[PDB]
Design a protein around this nucleic acid. Sequence first.
RNA 1: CAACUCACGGCAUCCAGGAAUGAAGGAGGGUAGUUCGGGGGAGAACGUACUGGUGCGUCAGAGGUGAAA
Length: 135
Amino acid sequence: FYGSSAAKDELVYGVVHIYASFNDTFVHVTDMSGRETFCKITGGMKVKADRDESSPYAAMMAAQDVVARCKECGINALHVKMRATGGVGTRSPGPGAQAALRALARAGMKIGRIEDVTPIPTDSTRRKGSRRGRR
RNA sequence: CAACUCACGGCAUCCAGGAAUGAAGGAGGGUAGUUCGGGGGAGAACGUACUGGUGCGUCAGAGGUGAAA
């Protein structure tokens, strides 16, 4: 395997970006800089159906097959950053989390310092749609 | 021309006999508190976000919807 030469049985943290939306989930894995990756596995890939990309089953079935790589890279622990659709999109996250997290934690990864990093504008121009909304 | 009790007289002589009703629970104008405030104009900076681009990583899906295209 291609893992660390540092220590044995002493925690090595990665960073995990859990992108939640109403039309997809992603799970992504990086080191600390975010200039280098280890995984990039998306809810969509684990299903065949446009409908069922974002549903909680999909999410979990990504998260599994992420930790199925990360262990081999020597990543024991994780730090987790939760994100929602956009800045002019919704502050509320998708149902692809409360799926994702609850997989990872019971997949034999450790966890610490969960955060919410999502775009919040000081102000924006126009939200897409119209004065009367979608109707 | 001056000197010179007091008078006459001379002096682009002066002030006072309140000589001009009151100061509207009307208006106007002052003086002040470094007063009071998303009031107005000009100039110099600040903030994230949307969008585009560049560099560095990864690799097959991503967008979108009730379901799709």
